Design a binder for this molecule. Sequence first.
Ligand SMILES: CC(C)(O)c1ccc(-c2nc3c(F)cc(F)cc3c(=O)[nH]2)cc1
Ligand SMILES: [Zn+2]
Length: 209
Amino acid sequence: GTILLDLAPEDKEYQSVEEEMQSTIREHRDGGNAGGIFNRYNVIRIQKVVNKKLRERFCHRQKEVSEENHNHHNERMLFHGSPFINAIIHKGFDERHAYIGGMFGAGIYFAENSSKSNQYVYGIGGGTGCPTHKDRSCYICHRQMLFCRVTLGKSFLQFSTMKMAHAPPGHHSVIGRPSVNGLAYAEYVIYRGEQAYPEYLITYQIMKP
Ligand SMILES: CC(C)(O)c1ccc(-c2nc3c(F)cc(F)cc3c(=O)[nH]2)cc1
Ligand SMILES: [Zn+2]
């Protein structure tokens, strides 16, 4: 099964992940309702997720998408928050557990801004917040999020909602791009679980400003 390798804070790999997580924090349009109010995270640990079987499924699909898209698989490192993160590290990403109510329909959603994925750690809209205190802005409880390899292939770009069950014909993913009267931050959607790998597991707290 899945093995977690602990990365030391002194390692460049830990430092790159933490820097991407911290630098991509943004102020959200919901006044912090979903994910809480913070300018910084306190990173507890960063672990590399090892699973040969899951890795093979991901690499097999990446090669297939690369062949279909003029040798450009268009992988990107992106964040994912979910209340069911434990299932993802042990069983991998699964479109059978898609976010049905997402703006692009029943896909698996990722963010390039860590704070957007932080809005989903305790569920859609932040749910009822942490299990212990029922606080979406809890500064005590440890949160987890994933920093993932995502195979995008040929993306269908959109500015506003377009619900679908599967990728558009001839495409491998959908991207919601930010725009003036539209999205604040980008989102990336795949419709096949084998198009993402949970590369890193980050344990963190949000910090009170
Ligand atoms: C079905 C359920 C509850 O398991 C679930 C629901 C939504 C997410 C989720 N949505 C996201 C989103 F819409 C846009 C975005 F940019 C990132 C994200 C993200 O990181 N996570 C994850 C799990
Ligand atoms: Zn709490």
